[PDB]
């Protein structure tokens, strides 16, 4: 069903060591297609996927112009945040921004996003209705009243329902092989004795796309969210993802435990039990 | 495709 496009941008002020560093990356679902690094030699929006390289010359000149303008504005926004929080300009701070759009199976606009965080905390977020803002703190209330007075939401909504979705539809047709695919997880169990009395069962999911996945543990059909360990979903480095979950288990009790895997690429959710 | 205008906090 749903496809998404996201831009993630980080501004980091380094007072002394020059102007703030700005990094932006674009994703369609869990595939990167571009990057900009203010500190790099090129000074350009760069391709980061083989399928995006067939975008014409004007694409690259326009996206470069627009990401350098984004650079300037988020540079100014760090200085405004200093005022609002009455912080010294000796300190290093992080402004993070995430925006983009979703389309359904039918190719219709589903969802828009436009969110900021200031040194790792929610600052302001465009609501799901795309008509109003969520301010997480007292500084963000100032921004919110400014933005409601200037009709910033109405203007962003036109971008999100316009150029954002138009971009996403085009990428989905030009990167079809990579983006409109599911790779099901290859699953298995490992068993690691850790004592006379204790053992670790590890449930594995390798080589799946997209990255969205659920690994859950049960003990005789009861949810085991206890002595349980879930690693972050990690890239394989080749367009696919990996994950494991583990439970530490009294010796002899292995057969009572089940790993349950959900992924779009599986017809039915798997159950796995230790029995090699 | 990026927007052509970003808001100031």
């Amino acid at each position, epitope marked *: 069903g749903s496809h998404s496009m996201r831009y993630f941008s980080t501004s980091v002020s380094r007072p002394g060591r020059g102007e703030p560093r700005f990094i932006a990356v674009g994703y369609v679902d869990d595939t990167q297609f571009v990057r900009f690094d203010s500190d790099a030699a090129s000074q350009r929006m760069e391709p980061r996927a083989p399928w995006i390289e067939q975008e014409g010359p004007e694409y690259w000149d326009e996206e470069t*112009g*627009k990401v*350098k*303008a984004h650079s*300037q*504005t988020d540079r*100014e926004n760090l*200085r405004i945040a200093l005022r609002y929080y009455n912080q010294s300009e000796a300190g290093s701070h992080t402004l993070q921004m995430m925006f983009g759009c979703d389309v359904g199976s039918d190719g219709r606009f589903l969802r828009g996003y436009h969110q900021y965080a200031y040194d790792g905390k929610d600052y302001i977020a465009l609501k799901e209705d795309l008509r109003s803002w969520t301010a997480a703190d007292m500084a963000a209330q100032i921004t919110k009243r*400014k*933005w409601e*007075a*200037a*009709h*910033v939401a*109405e*203007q962003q*909504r*036109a*971008y999100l*329902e*316009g*150029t954002c979705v138009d971009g996403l539809r085009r990428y989905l047709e030009n990167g079809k092989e990579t983006l409109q695919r599911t790779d099901p997880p290859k699953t298995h169990m490992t068993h690691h004795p850790i004592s006379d009395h204790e053992a670790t069962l590890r449930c594995w999911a390798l080589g799946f796309y997209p990255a969205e996945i659920t690994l859950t543990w049960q003990r005789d059909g009861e949810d085991q969210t206890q002595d349980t360990e879930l690693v972050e979903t990690r890239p394989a480095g080749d367009g696919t993802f990996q994950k494991w979950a583990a439970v530490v288990v009294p010796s002899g009790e292995e057969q009572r435990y089940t790993c349950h895997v959900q992924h779009e690429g599986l017809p039915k959710p798997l159950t796995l039990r230790w029995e090699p | *495709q990026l*927007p*052509r*205008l970003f*808001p*100031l906090l």
Partner: T-cell receptor
Amino acid sequence: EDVEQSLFLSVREGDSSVINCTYTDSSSTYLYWYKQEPGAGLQLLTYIFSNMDMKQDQRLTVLLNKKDKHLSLRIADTQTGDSAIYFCAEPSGNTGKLIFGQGTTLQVKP
Amino acid sequence: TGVSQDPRHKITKRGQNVTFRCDPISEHNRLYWYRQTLGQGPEFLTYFQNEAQLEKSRLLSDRFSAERPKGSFSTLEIQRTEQGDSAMYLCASSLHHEQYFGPGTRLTVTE
């Protein structure tokens, strides 16, 4: 590549005046009508966002066709006081700086 | 009626310097200068995002120089004026996208 509108439109008092305007970029998320009287400065008259078909305010109607880049201003029951120069404006590049049509002088005839 | 421009009208001898002032609506972060000749649409001169001048046109030659030292007010200076410089010099400000224009500075350059 320019914002094109006609230089001159004559209309009879009480009739509806339509002012047409073709703009440059489909990626433009808003389009403005400014009005200029003989003496005074640019008045921001009305606007529309690229995801609306039509907007209404008193006698003013704005129609947008994003596909063809066609914007139009409809004045209902045109009065002699509606005589002025009407400029359509579109954002250009990444600063929100405006490019302007040459402007339509609306002559209302008693 | 929030954007102020000074002076409203100016006459200078060709070859002299002139300075205009624009006071934007109180808290407006974005400020734009445009030139307008009678008959015609305003033409962009330059753009300020707070203190930073991020864009100038090719219309803005060596002789033209804008500053916005503290954000707040902006000034456009023309050096060694020619008769082609005679025009309305407009200022606009916005919070985001909506641009409010002042009444302009009507410059006349005479021999």
